[PDB]
Design an enzyme around this catalytic site. Structure first.
Site, short mmCIF file in Angstrom:
data_model
loop_
_atom_site.label_atom_id
_atom_site.label_comp_id
_atom_site.label_asym_id
_atom_site.label_seq_id
_atom_site.Cartn_x
_atom_site.Cartn_y
_atom_site.Cartn_z
N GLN A 77 0.60 -1.03 0.12
CA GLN A 77 -0.03 0.00 -0.02
C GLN A 77 0.41 1.36 0.30
O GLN A 77 1.91 1.34 0.71
CB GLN A 77 -1.17 -0.16 1.45
CG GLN A 77 -1.94 1.71 1.84
CD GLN A 77 -2.97 1.25 2.53
OE1 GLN A 77 -2.90 -0.08 3.39
NE2 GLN A 77 -3.85 2.04 2.35
N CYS A 83 -6.79 0.02 1.93
CA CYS A 83 -6.64 -0.95 2.30
C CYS A 83 -7.24 -2.51 2.14
O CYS A 83 -7.01 -3.37 1.67
CB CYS A 83 -6.11 -1.28 3.62
SG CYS A 83 -8.13 -0.55 4.50
N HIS A 240 -7.82 -1.00 9.48
CA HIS A 240 -7.49 -1.81 8.38
C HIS A 240 -7.61 -2.85 8.07
O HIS A 240 -7.82 -3.86 8.82
CB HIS A 240 -5.66 -1.37 9.06
CG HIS A 240 -4.99 -1.59 7.98
ND1 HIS A 240 -5.04 -0.70 6.74
CD2 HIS A 240 -4.58 -2.54 7.46
CE1 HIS A 240 -3.50 -1.17 6.01
NE2 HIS A 240 -2.81 -2.27 6.48
N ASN A 264 -0.54 -7.74 6.64
CA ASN A 264 -0.99 -6.25 6.31
C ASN A 264 -0.97 -6.17 4.90
O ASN A 264 0.19 -5.48 4.90
CB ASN A 264 0.09 -5.44 7.66
CG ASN A 264 -0.25 -3.98 7.86
OD1 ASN A 264 -0.76 -3.34 7.05
ND2 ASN A 264 -0.54 -2.97 8.51
N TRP A 266 0.18 -2.80 4.16
CA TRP A 266 1.28 -2.12 3.99
C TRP A 266 2.51 -2.96 3.51
O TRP A 266 3.57 -2.18 3.07
CB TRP A 266 1.56 -1.47 5.31
CG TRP A 266 0.71 -0.28 5.98
CD1 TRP A 266 -0.46 -0.06 5.44
CD2 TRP A 266 0.49 0.63 6.90
NE1 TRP A 266 -0.94 1.23 5.79
CE2 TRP A 266 -0.74 0.98 7.64
CE3 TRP A 266 0.99 0.03 8.10
CZ2 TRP A 266 -0.81 1.64 7.84
CZ3 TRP A 266 1.11 0.81 8.96
CH2 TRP A 266 -0.81 1.92 9.40
C1 LIG Z 1 -7.47 1.41 4.70
C2 LIG Z 1 -6.40 1.54 5.16
O1 LIG Z 1 -5.76 2.33 4.13
O2 LIG Z 1 -5.46 1.16 5.93
C3 LIG Z 1 -8.42 2.00 5.78
O3 LIG Z 1 -8.35 2.35 6.92
C4 LIG Z 1 -9.34 1.80 5.25
O4 LIG Z 1 -10.02 1.60 4.11
N1 LIG Z 1 -11.05 1.57 6.30
C5 LIG Z 1 -12.25 1.03 6.68
C6 LIG Z 1 -12.14 -0.15 6.85
C7 LIG Z 1 -11.68 -1.43 7.30
C8 LIG Z 1 -11.38 -1.52 6.37
C9 LIG Z 1 -11.83 -2.20 8.06
C10 LIG Z 1 -12.96 2.08 6.14
O5 LIG Z 1 -13.07 3.07 7.59
N2 LIG Z 1 -14.54 2.05 6.24
C11 LIG Z 1 -15.80 2.77 6.48
C12 LIG Z 1 -15.49 3.55 4.75
C13 LIG Z 1 -17.03 3.93 4.63
C14 LIG Z 1 -17.62 3.82 3.24
N3 LIG Z 1 -17.39 2.22 3.23
C15 LIG Z 1 -17.90 1.42 1.93
N4 LIG Z 1 -17.46 -0.08 2.35
N5 LIG Z 1 -17.37 1.48 0.32
#
Ligand SMILES: *[C@@H](C(=O)O)[C@H](O)C(=O)N[C@@H](CC(C)C)C(=O)NCCCCNC(N)=[NH2+]
Ligand SMILES: [Ca+2]
Ligand SMILES: [Ca+2]
Length: 322
Positions: A77, A83, A240, A264, A266
């Site tokens: 990433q 993520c 994440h 991860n 990353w």
């Molecule tokens: C991931 C990263 O690059 O570190 C980043 O935090 C992320 O995508 N966060 C997500 C949750 C993880 C995949 C558990 C998040 O916070 N999602 C909420 C987004 C709300 C809109 N969601 C969608 N799924 N279209």
């Protein structure tokens, strides 16, 4: 037998560019700020400062599409919050059947190279072929978004771009749901498990899923949106997505322990508890299991006992195919 996204024909475009002595430039997803984003990555943003679009053939003398196979370590990433997508791509590499569908073979930067690549995704209710030119966002000669542990490898960066193209821009990929990516790569059925109310035979469910080639991902929920990208004391990243990559059992001090392996996206920053790369526990197991399972490398992948896994993680998503 996929359908052409937007009507763009990979082979025809490639042949055409080769005949005309030029490299492909995608009118559908051009090398300009609108393809990067609209706010955090908009033209008037600080995160896009210094970002220039360059082809792999402009950056290196020997760019390669795939080096030593397309594997999970090829997914590291960058400065984009995608993520959820990257964990999915990493899981995808564990099922060659689906990987071979999403990433068509025969693509390279040598013979027949015309600055164009293509991938297939499950979109709009069907398998579609998406083309992209190889102009990628770069800063100081380095890829800004996803990149491979192998510095001259580009398939993952190009796949991320095609996924960005179908969604409008890279910024559109910031924030998401792992299951959404799983479905776009499989067209399969997704399920999720509340690790706080996990079934008694959840480990068995994971074993079978991993055996059938299903895609699995997990994550740790946060009290709110302020604890974004917050690393725990045990060195796990919350909010994440992680790829679940394996499940094996080992004999620890007389009794077998159920272990689970995850990565991860990353490509670094791993769990620092029992079963971690430099953890002591690996001494209390038999050599065979130790040499066959433990890998001392900062690659973002690590083992955890299933017990610790369900305590630390809050959600598990599984996508099953045909
Ligand atoms: C991931 C990263 O690059 O570190 C980043 O935090 C992320 O995508 N966060 C997500 C949750 C993880 C995949 C558990 C998040 O916070 N999602 C909420 C987004 C709300 C809109 N969601 C969608 N799924 N279209
Ligand atoms: Ca590789
Ligand atoms: Ca590791």
């Amino acid at each position: 037998n996929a359908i052409k996204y937007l009507g763009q024909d990979y082979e025809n475009l490639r042949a055409r560019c080769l005949q005309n002595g030029v490299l492909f430039q995608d009118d559908a997803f051009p090398p300009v700020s609108h393809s990067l984003g609209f706010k955090e990555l908009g033209p008037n943003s600080s995160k896009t400062y210094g970002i220039k679009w360059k082809r792999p053939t402009e950056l290196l003398s020997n760019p390669q599409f795939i080096v030593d196979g397309a594997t999970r370590t090829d997914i590291c990433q960058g400065a984009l919050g995608d993520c959820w997508l990257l964990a999915a791509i990493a899981s995808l590499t564990l099922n060659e059947t689906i990987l071979h569908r999403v990433v068509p073979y025969g693509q390279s930067f040598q013979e027949g190279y015309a600055g164009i690549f293509h991938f297939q995704l499950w979109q709009f209710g069907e398998w579609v072929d998406v083309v992209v030119d190889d102009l990628l966002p770069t800063k100081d000669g380095k890829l800004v978004f996803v990149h491979s542990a192998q510095g001259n490898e580009f398939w993952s960066a190009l796949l991320e771009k095609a996924y960005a193209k179908v969604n409008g821009s890279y910024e559109a990929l910031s924030g998401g749901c792992t299951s959404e990516a799983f479905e776009d790569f499989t067209g399969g059925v997704t399920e999720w498990y509340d690790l706080q109310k996990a079934p008694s035979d959840l480990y068995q469910i994971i074993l079978k899923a991993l055996e059938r080639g299903s895609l699995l991902g997990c994550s740790i929920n946060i009290s709110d949106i302020r604890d974004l990208e917050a690393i725990t004391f045990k060195n796990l990243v919350r909010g994440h997505a992680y790829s679940v990559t394996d499940a094996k059992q080992v004999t620890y001090q007389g009794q077998r322990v159920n272990l689970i392996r995850m990565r991860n996206p990353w490509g670094e920053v791993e769990w620092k508890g029992p079963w971690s790369d430099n953890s002591y526990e690996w001494n209390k197991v038999d050599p065979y299991e130790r040499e066959q399972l433990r890998v001392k490398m900062e690659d973002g992948e690590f083992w955890m006992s299933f017990r610790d896994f369900i305590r630390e993680f809050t959600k598990l998503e599984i996508c099953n195919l045909t």
